[PDB]
Amino acid sequence: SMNPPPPETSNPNKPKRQTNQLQYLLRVVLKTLWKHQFAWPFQQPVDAVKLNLPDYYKIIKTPMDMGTIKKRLENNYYWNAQECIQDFNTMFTNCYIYNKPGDDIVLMAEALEKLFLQKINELPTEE
Numbered sequence: 001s002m003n004p005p006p007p008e009t010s011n012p013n014k015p016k017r018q019t020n021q022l023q024y025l026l027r028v029v030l031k032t033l034w035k036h037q038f039a040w041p042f043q044q045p046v047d048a049v050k051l052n053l054p055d056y057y058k059i060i061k062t063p064m065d066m067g068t069i070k071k072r073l074e075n076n077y078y079w080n081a082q083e084c085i086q087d088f089n090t091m092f093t094n095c096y097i098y099n100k101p102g103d104d105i106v107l108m109a110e111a112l113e114k115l116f117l118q119k120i121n122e123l124p125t126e127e
């Protein structure tokens, strides 16, 4: 079995910013989800080999996880908040696409997504 390369977290060619919205996404959004009891499956890329999910990367073509998002935020990979918000939404969507309704992992994603939505609702205006 084989995992794909992880998503990109470093690209010197890509223009970068450190904006107050992106700071909020790290300090509030990421940190809130990261510390949650259901965070652990989402803290690194899905290891399809160890988890014995040989069809995972057949179905999921835009993988994303909070480990990757954490690296992107801490290493200032983004230009804007929308990019990062999209990464979170990709992460949740992948979970719902791959798994069955009511599965434990789906319930975990739903709990994290509820908090995500609560925090993004108060994304500060640009300074």
Ligand SMILES: Cc1nnc2n1-c1sccc1C(c1ccccc1)=NC2
Binding pocket: 041, 042, 046, 047, 051, 094, 095, 098, 099, 104, 105
């Ligand atoms: C993320 C993600 N998206 N789909 C899956 N996962 C992961 S990544 C580590 C375990 C799981 C699990 C899982 C299953 C039951 C309880 C906790 C995690 N299911 C497969």
